[PDB]
Amino acid sequence: TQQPIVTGTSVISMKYDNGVIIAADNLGSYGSLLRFNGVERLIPVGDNTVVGISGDISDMQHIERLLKDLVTENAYDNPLADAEEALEPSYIFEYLATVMYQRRSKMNPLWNAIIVAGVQSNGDQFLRYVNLLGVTYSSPTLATGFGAHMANPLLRKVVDRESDIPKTTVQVAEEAIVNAMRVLYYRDARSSRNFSLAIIDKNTGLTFKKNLQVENMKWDFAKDIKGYGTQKI
Amino acid sequence: IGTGYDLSNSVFSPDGRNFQVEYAVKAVENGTTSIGIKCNDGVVFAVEKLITSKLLVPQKNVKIQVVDRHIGCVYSGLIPDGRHLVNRGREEAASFKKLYKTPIPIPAFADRLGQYVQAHTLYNSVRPFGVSTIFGGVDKNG
Numbered sequence: 001t002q003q004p005i006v007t008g009t010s011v012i013s014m015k016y017d018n019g020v021i022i023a024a025d026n027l028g029s030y031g032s033l034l035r036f037n038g039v040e041r042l043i044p045v046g047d048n049t050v051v052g053i054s055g056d057i058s059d060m061q062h063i064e065r066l067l068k069d070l071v072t073e074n075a076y077d078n079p080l081a082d083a084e085e086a087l088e089p090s091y092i093f094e095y096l097a098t099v100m101y102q103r104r105s106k107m108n109p110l111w112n113a114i115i116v117a118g119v120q121s122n123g124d125q126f127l128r129y130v131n132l133l134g135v136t137y138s139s140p141t142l143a144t145g146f147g148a149h150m151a152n153p154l155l156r157k158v159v160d161r162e163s164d165i166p167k168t169t170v171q172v173a174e175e176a177i178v179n180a181m182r183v184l185y186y187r188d189a190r191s192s193r194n195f196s197l198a199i200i201d202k203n204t205g206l207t208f209k210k211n212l213q214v215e216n217m218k219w220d221f222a223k224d225i226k227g228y229g230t231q232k233i
Numbered sequence: 234i235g236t237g238y239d240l241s242n243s244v245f246s247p248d249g250r251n252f253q254v255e256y257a258v259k260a261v262e263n264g265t266t267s268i269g270i271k272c273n274d275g276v277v278f279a280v281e282k283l284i285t286s287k288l289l290v291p292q293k294n295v296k297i298q299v300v301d302r303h304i305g306c307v308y309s310g311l312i313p314d315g316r317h318l319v320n321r322g323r324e325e326a327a328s329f330k331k332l333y334k335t336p337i338p339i340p341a342f343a344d345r346l347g348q349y350v351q352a353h354t355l356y357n358s359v360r361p362f363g364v365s366t367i368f369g370g371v372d373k374n375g
Binding site: 075 | 330
């Protein structure tokens with residue numbers, strides 16, 4: 001892809017004591033037009049991985065097809081596809097990052113930012129990032145687009161270093177994610193009110209909440225704002 | 234009238250047969266037993282694995298192979314030829330799903346495998362498959 005067209009805005013994610021949380025809206029933007037309402041940008045892989053994809057929606061569908069084919073080919077000639085040889089988040093991220101770097105080096109990249117979030121077999125939380133350039137980095141808080149500027153500072157207030165990960169609970173992390181989504185809906189023009197949220201917990205497994213909405217919106221103070229400054233009424 | 238018609242593949246004997254194909258069939262007859270049974274809403278495959286020695290790890294050395302997420306395949310004869318055939322079938326199903334999104338129909342997959350095995354009987358440069366394959370699964374037509 002040389003020029004992105006239909007785009008997804010942001011994907012936010014954060015670690016917590018027993019796993020990871022990720023979230024992304026359901027909006028497909030035709031540049032400055034919010035054309036498609038209801039487009040799932042979180043792709044679950046297995047029962048232990050979630051891939052959040054922002055950017056070109058066609059390349060996102062291509063990555064969906066690639067992930068489904070990878071799941072299919074992992075079942076081939078494998079009796080332990082259920083466990084001990086199931087797809088791990090690290091494998092999926094390595095495959096995705098290799099694909100991104102290759103398509104970069106061929107001067108035809110997938111216009112996407114990908115966040116892989118899950119729990120390993122030994123219970124370790126895996127949270128990693130890749131982009132169209134192939135840059136890979138890990139942090140207890142990971143966001144793309146506007147979320148990298150606004151949602152990140154909020155989530156980092158919850159978890160500022162690795163020592164804070166065991167202290168953070170699932171409720172605190174989910175509340176922080178919802179607050180960051182509300183802030184994004186406030187200050188991002190290419191954002192939506194509807195979003196989906198995935199929780200990969202080393203005990204409860206994969207929780208996938210769809211059709212979530214932004215609530216508790218402070219807008220009353222708008223009635224008292226009159227004029228560009230000088231105007232009284 | 235003549236002799237040596239069984240020394241080259243895709244060569245027609247005076248009767249109208251391909252003796253290399255029948256020799257491959259002889260090779261499959263030597264193989265172990267494998268069966269398939271179609272029920273009302275699906276299929277079942279079963280195979281006998283000969284315990285050559287008790288040093289073999291039981292429940293390993295599996296014989297039935299999965300194609301896509303809805304096709305099962307078993308074969309009697311030269312197991313490596315069966316693995317080659319299921320690999321080609323997986324490639325065909327992947328191409329079909331890539332272009333058409335729907336999982337490959339069972340008649341389509343059967344015709345793909347049949348055309349591959351048939352093309353393996355058109356040239357004296359390739360050996361016919363040494364396996365008989367029982368496969369199938371469930372699609373939108375049952």
